[PDB]
Amino acid sequence: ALDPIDFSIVLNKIKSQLEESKEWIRRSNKILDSI
Amino acid sequence: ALDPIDFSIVLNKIKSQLEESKEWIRRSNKILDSI
Amino acid sequence: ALDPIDFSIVLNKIKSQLEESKEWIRRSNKILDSI
Amino acid sequence: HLEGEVNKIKSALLSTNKAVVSLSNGVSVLTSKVLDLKNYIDKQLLPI
Amino acid sequence: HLEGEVNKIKSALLSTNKAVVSLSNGVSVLTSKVLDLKNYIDKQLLPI
Amino acid sequence: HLEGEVNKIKSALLSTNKAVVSLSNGVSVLTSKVLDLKNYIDKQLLPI
């Protein structure tokens, strides 16, 4: 049985992880921009 | 209410974005291949 | 008609591809760690 | 020759970085649509 | 020593690039399957 | 100056690599949830 609360929590966590991914790229871009 | 036209449009746009991602990597690979 | 066997096979293959992606990053991290 | 190679690697990584942001945004939208699909099913299952 | 380090970074980025293409292809297939799932639901909802 | 630039590029790629692993893990979880969603639909369709 698919827990509806868990399903939303897990996919909303994925969205949070993706924002973290974007933050890592911003850091990389900034470092390269300094070169 | 989930718009069926919008749903298809958005996911087909994601597929277009992924092809753009692949194009950026091809550019990176070409630059490195020149080294 | 959506083949249920094919659907599972394809998504389980995506999961295998992602592990391959993680392996490529491990290789990159190791090379950089050697610098 | 070395400075040139370094400049090339910087250019390559900027391009790789563009690919990752594009990918990240794409997965973010897909995740939102899967949530929307789950909501549609649950709200569509009520009568049936 | 510097040339060696540059060669290493090139090798590392080629590997990172391989990871991104693999990821991109994977998300492309998943998006196609989510579209297929939506089509299945809509065509499966007709009787029920 | 060149050594410094190389060190910077290494730092940048380590950060890009972190972004890709995060992305990969995210897509892996989403794929598992889409499989779970398909199972739910098929098991939920039985009565209706």
Measured distance CA(B21)–CA(A32) in Å, rounded: 19
Burial of B28 (0-12, 13-18, 19+ CB in 10 A): buried
Experimental technique, in short, is X-ray
Burial of F46 (0-12, 13-18, 19+ CB in 10 A): exposed
Measured distance CA(C24)–CA(E35) in Å, rounded: 29
Question: How many angstroms is the resolution?
Answer: 1.5
CA F1 to chain C, closest CA, distance in angstroms equals: 17
Burial of C25 (0-12, 13-18, 19+ CB in 10 A): buried
CB A31 within 8 A of CB F15: yes
Q: How many domains does chain E have?
A: 1
The tokens 């394809």 sit on which residue? C10
Contact C11 E33 (CB under 8 A): yes
In this structure, which amino acid lies at residue A19?
A: E
Contact F5 D2 (CB under 8 A): no
| ∠ Cα E43 E38 B14 (to 5°) | 145
What secondary structure letter does DSSP report for C22?
H
Contact D42 A7 (CB under 8 A): no
Within 13 A of E32's CA, how many CA atoms are on the CB side? 13
What number of C-beta contacts closer than 8 Å exist between B and E?
A: 40
CATH classification at residue F20? 1.20.5.300
Contact E20 B21 (CB under 8 A): yes
- The separation between CA C35 and the C-alpha centre of its own chain, rounded to angstroms, equals 26
CB D26 within 8 A of CB B17: yes
Query: CB count, 10 Å around CB of D26?
Result: 26
Which of F3, F16, F17 has the most C C-beta neighbours within 10 Å, making it the best mutation to test the interface with C? F17
CA B8 to chain E, closest CA, distance in angstroms equals: 7
In chain C, what residues touch F35 (CB-CB under 8 Å)? Answer: 8, 11-12
Domain range holding F29?
1-48
3-state secondary structure F1-48: CHHHHHHHHHHHHHHHHHHHHHHHHHHHHHHHHHHHHHHHHHHHHCCC
Contacts for F3 with CB less than 8 Å, ≥ 6 apart? E2
Nearest in space to F9 (alpha carbons), one of C23, B25, B26, D17: D17
Q: Is the dihedral angle over the CA atoms D28, F26, A28, E10 positive or is it negative? A: negative
Query: What torsion do the CA atoms of C21, C25, C30, C35 make, to the nearest 10 degrees?
Result: 150
In chain D, what residues touch E31 (CB-CB under 8 Å)? Answer: 26, 30
Neighbours of chain F (3+ CB pairs under 8 A): A, C, D, E
In which element (H, E) is residue A25 found? helix A4-33
Q: Is the dihedral angle over the CA atoms F6, F8, F9, F11 positive or is it negative? A: positive
The string of DSSP codes covering A8-21 is HHHHHHHHHHHHHH
Nearest in space to A15 (alpha carbons), one of D36, E7, C23: D36
